[PDB]
Amino acid sequence: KIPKRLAAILEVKPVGDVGGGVTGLLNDASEIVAWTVSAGIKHLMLYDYDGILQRNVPELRMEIHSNLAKYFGPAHVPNYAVKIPHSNKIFYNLDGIEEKDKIAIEISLLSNRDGRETIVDLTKTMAELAAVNELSVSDITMDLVDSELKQLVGPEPDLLLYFGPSLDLQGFPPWHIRLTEFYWEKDNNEVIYSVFIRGLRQYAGCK
Amino acid sequence: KIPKRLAAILEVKPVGDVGGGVTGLLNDASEIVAWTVSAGIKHLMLYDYDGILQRNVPELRMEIHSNLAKYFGPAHVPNYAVKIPHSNKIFYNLDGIEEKDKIAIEISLLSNRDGRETIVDLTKTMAELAAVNELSVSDITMDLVDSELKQLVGPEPDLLLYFGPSLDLQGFPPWHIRLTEFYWEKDNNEVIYSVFIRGLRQYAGCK
């Protein structure tokens, strides 16, 4: 039993630390991508509070390709797509940078603006639609808000991994985490494979 | 350093299991109340998805008194209030059942209805007022949503305790948990004092 949809919250760390800074953040993201693909998981959400990932997409796409080549061999890089929901942008493989076209993993990049701020914007949108008589107040339902936020932000993750010592959601979109299970480790302060693996084992039902 | 505001998510167990059912839930709730008062914490949110606690308020109130008498002696039961935000009800001590009037702990009972469905309710309220121009769309802001949900549901908890093995918020009101700290134990599947205490020690920063 593996999650169909995986999420991870990443934190940027001092550049003087080993594997820190923005480059370190992108490397951590690409490690998580390779681990997720290796586990057979086809949907991944990566979140960081300020949107560093969203502002470094070219470098991220190159790091993902490089890391996938390390795990799968340079001739067998799984196909991937990187999506930014709030701009409706999607990027495939290294198209534009550098059957057998099926996407092995789709990676969505999220930040704080995609959470509460997006819900406030949605409430304004629905109020404006009611004020111009295009939406009945009684048609504002859970199903409508659900489907709107699913389109604006994305579907709910089954499991969310956090690699710091104390769970801090730090703005992660709070609507579609009704049943999401969270995993982290009390000591941990680094993005390392053994924590990823223990999180999946916990989700699966191991001891 | 103790949290000023404590939350606990409770799960109901099979009615046939040992310490299960509604009786088991109420005993767990009243234990957490006694432990919280003993630690000096004056604000407690108790959440269960279906609102079982809200449907069993008389018995809960009795159990709280009974359990407090066990911890403090029958002659020194701290004063307590049980509040239900969704219905705007509040009950003091055993009034109506059976300085020296100061409330030692206020216990709020929450359920899934207090979470996303309440955000939908708020969206409908704002949409209706916007539709008759009692509310400008420009005034639908983060500050407004923050204050409305704080009034409808309650303030943000500093620490949230979960007594199952994999943290699942299961509908806990998601807006005002921005900086909330979360605690649970990977092995655990029962409401026991040692998990409560280890959670408070983690929050404090102990070794």
UniProtKB/Swiss-Prot annotation, chains A, B:
Coiled coil: none annotated. GO terms for cellular component: dehydrodolichyl diphosphate synthase complex; endoplasmic reticulum; endoplasmic reticulum membrane; lipid droplet; nuclear envelope; nuclear membrane. Its cofactor is Mg(2+). It is an enzyme of class 2 (transferase). GO terms for biological process: dolichol biosynthetic process; protein glycosylation. Keywords: Endoplasmic reticulum, Lipid droplet, Magnesium, Membrane, Nucleus, Transferase, Transmembrane, Transmembrane helix. It is a single-pass membrane protein. The keyword Lipid biosynthesis does not apply. Its EC number is 2.5.1.87. Pathway: Protein modification; protein glycosylation. It comes from the Eukaryota. One of its GO terms (molecular function) is ditrans,polycis-polyprenyl diphosphate synthase [(2E,6E)-farnesyl diphosphate specific] activity. It catalyses: n isopentenyl diphosphate + (2E,6E)-farnesyl diphosphate = a di-trans,poly-cis-polyprenyl diphosphate + n diphosphate. It is found in: Endoplasmic reticulum membrane; Lipid droplet; Nucleus membrane. Forms an active dehydrodolichyl diphosphate synthase complex with either SRT1 or RER2. With SRT1 or RER2, forms the dehydrodolichyl diphosphate synthase (DDS) complex, an essential component of the dolichol monophosphate (Dol-P) biosynthetic machinery. Adds multiple copies of isopentenyl pyrophosphate (IPP) to farnesyl pyrophosphate (FPP) to produce dehydrodolichyl diphosphate (Dedol-PP), a precursor of dolichol which is utilized as a sugar carrier in protein glycosylation in the endoplasmic reticulum (ER). Belongs to the UPP synthase family. This is Dehydrodolichyl diphosphate synthase complex subunit NUS1. The lineage of its organism: Eukaryota, Fungi, Dikarya, Ascomycota, Saccharomycotina. The chain holds residues 151 to 370 of 375 of the full protein.
